[model samples]
Target: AKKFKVVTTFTIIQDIAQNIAGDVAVVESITKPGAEIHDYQPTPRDIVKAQSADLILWNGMNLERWFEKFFESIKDVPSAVVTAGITPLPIREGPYSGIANPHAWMSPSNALIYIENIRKALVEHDPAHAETYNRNAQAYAEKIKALDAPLRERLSRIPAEQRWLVTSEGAFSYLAKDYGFKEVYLWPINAEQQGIPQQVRHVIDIIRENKIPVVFSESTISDKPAKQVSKETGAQYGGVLYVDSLSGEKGPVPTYISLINMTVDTIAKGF
Candidate 1:
């Protein structure tokens, strides 16, 4: 039996690859929990992992802006962007420009696409383990579909009028699209742009004028401005949603699946 060596760009993608590769591949993840990939400068060890990996997987479209240089630094390694086949949402024309939103897995439905893409890559890389990759992905997909039900149920309780989900990044577009909530954000995708006066003011005005009682801060982004908005607008500070990466093991969101589950729980319980 041959073992495959896989290196993932971040924790969320690491979880997806682990589900498909399960025990058959040795997986190493680069970005730590609650870290931003856009600015992450890979350490010497990270470069070594890229050099050693049989296949490297990352969320592309400049999601990991540092990746091109990292790839150039490595030799003879194969890499795939999991979102290669995804129809990218138009870069939300805002203060930000020209960067596609890479948080496609904010919807578990889209995550199904991610897993299939990953499974396809693994089967291509290790034809011997193809069946195992597919079987594992199917089991995970089933669990994700089952998991989405309760999330929908909880979100439904919040009347559509109160369904404004504001975050620092427009990261919830996919989830908001699926779950029927209107979302607003400070930045188009958080890779570029600032959480400055115009961004914060717009969100505050929305809360005050619309009377949306709660706004969410994600675990992956700083809660400072969100807290300021809560104070400034008097809207209840809704709990943190997990976007971008999973939290540490002891944290509420330890896995990609658990992260969304816990995110809904936090939002529901907070309000």
Candidate 2:
């Protein structure tokens, strides 16, 4: 049987699509493991690879700024936005203010929406295997949904006043909203200069004023900025949090489920 070649913009989407694809399609990510997905630059070879894909799945909402231009070069390849139908949170401040936050997949509930969109895309693109796609998506959604209760319960341990989730990037707005956290960060999005003096100072003031216990950085960026904030504000540096991309298989957050679980656990402990 000929297999469909599915290419995702990032590892997390690839993982979800792979689960839903099962034996029906070959799923791969355009951005390799640990590569920053935001404003990713694709080489000529990357374009060739993406051009050959049967389907290109991307998280829209400006998460992949490079992706739109890439599409101009690969005209005929069908693509789907996995984040479709999920209402986006706007970046309230920073240079990216008024734009939609593209990290909706950070929330497990939002993940279910991603999975369904992937499932629908797969089935639509390969109707012959609709049964397989539907079955796989249902099972995957069930597994993803199962984690929500426990994660929320674990997060509930922190008092409202201490429910601070500070990070290097404000990528967890959806997750914070879903799991009862007030999000703080050095910057709103990864597109701008990270770890700038002013950005770091602003976070320092936030931590000091709010008495935030610990601060964190995302896996794809340097932890130095958050560490600086921690040191200056006397807050503990919790650890690296996963958002835009997943780690390698041997790393802590190799899957989306683990990403959510690890992040929630880290936040709870940080509090």
Candidate 3:
């Protein structure tokens, strides 16, 4: 363990924090890879972990339903709401309509905002190492910008009519906003009803009307509903999209950069 320890609310933030401060600070995640994030219920062990960390970083766009309770219980450790500067896109459908979309990190520009906030937390946690923290943070930001260039460039070529991000959960609004793609889904959040006839039929209607060729599903949850949509409309089941979580070290999309690259490639191949 390093002089400073950071406990993030999820694996993606944990990966980002590690990139910014891993050399001088210890970073850990409360949630595991491939776990459902929107409705995560923290365990007592999670509480104990956050209590010991130098700082706790969380996405504050109403992403974690259990965070507020977890926050109050974990006494003195500082908390940084990483989604601080993002202009969150509202959930356009379901019971959560008009609330902030919790997946702001899905957009590179918004992720840069998260990077800056994480850098600040690292600096405050250990000012003596501020120079390293600042340098690494800038380097990480540059990497994100560089990685983003091609995903942005590649998607721009797809015909506007075919430019749609269809997923099981409406997790791609920020990404859709970033890349100029329309977002469609079966449900607003994974916590809501799954495979309900009403939601599935609505998405199926979109697929049939738009002549959209493919649909995708997230990594955390089942793809049965997405498949049903595909079956209903004869759209191809485009591969899995890695959002909300990363896989283990030896698995695909283990890191944040890898996750982005894989997701973009999956969406591209679907077209």
Candidate 4:
């Protein structure tokens, strides 16, 4: 049997496919862990890895803006959109509502969709392992399901009024929907930061007005907004969150699943 070689755009995608592929395939995450794919520039080594791989799985829908050239270079190879065909959240208008926010994994419900899409891709890429892929996906999905229980438990730790989350990007809409907490942002979208004057000010106003105790920061963005909010409002600065992308090997939340757990745990500790 030939060993399948695969590359994913980032760790989160790598996480989903890795469980299914298990040791059956060689899984390589092209972008470093904890890096933002939208602005990522893969190195020569990353290019070589992708070029040599039998399959390249990506979180398409323009998440990794710099991947166009990589895709062009690997023209003849098979590729899968791990996030393909899934309906993503439209950019919400509350300051950051007009752009498409690519951080869909913030919502676990959406993750179910990702698993299915990736499962389909796996079956297509390695049909000899179809039944096995389905089985792995099912087992993984069940494990993912277990998170909801502890997630609800974690969210309960925040006092009713303190449950709001203010982060650097408007990436947690799905999370807000899932955890029943309203999320505020320091930027409307990642494409452009309207900067300190608008979003951060607005968040500060909310923090003071609500007397919220904490604001969250993400692994990929500057903690300036969170720190500033803390300074101005005297609210506690909750630790960094693993929201948009998974951390690299040396990172605090290196795997997608661990990212979620780490986020909830971090928030719970501060709350």
For every model shown, the clashing-pair count is 0, 0, 0, 5
Runs off by more than 4 Å, candidate 3: none
The candidate, 1 or 2, that scores higher on lDDT is 2
In terms of lDDT, the poorest run of 10 residues in model 1 is 188-197
- Candidate 4, which ten residues in sequence have the lowest lDDT sum? 188-197
Question: Order of all candidates by lDDT, from best down to worst?
Answer: 2, 3, 1, 4
Can you write out model 4's per-residue Cα lDDT over 108-192, one digit (the tens) per residue?
7778888998788878888988888899999988888889998889778676666787777777877877887788877755654
Model 4 TM-score is 0.91
Candidate lDDT scores, in order, read: 0.81, 0.88, 0.88, 0.78
Stretches > 4 Å off in candidate 1: 192-195
Residue pairs clashing in model 4 are 33-248, 34-248, 92-97, 93-97, 96-188
lDDT score of residue 142 within candidate 3:
96
Query: How well does candidate 3 match the true structure in TM-score terms?
Result: 0.96
Candidate 2 scores a C-alpha RMSD against the true structure in Å of 1.4
Residues 1-271, candidate 3, lDDT per residue (tens digit)? Answer: 4478899999999999999985788889999998998888888898899999989999998899889987999888889899887887888777777988898888888879999999998898789889999999999999999977799776766888789889988888888887889998878877755455798888888888888999999999899989988888979999799989999989998899898888988998898
| Number of colliding residue pairs in model 2 | 0
TM-score against truth, every candidate: 0.94, 0.96, 0.96, 0.91
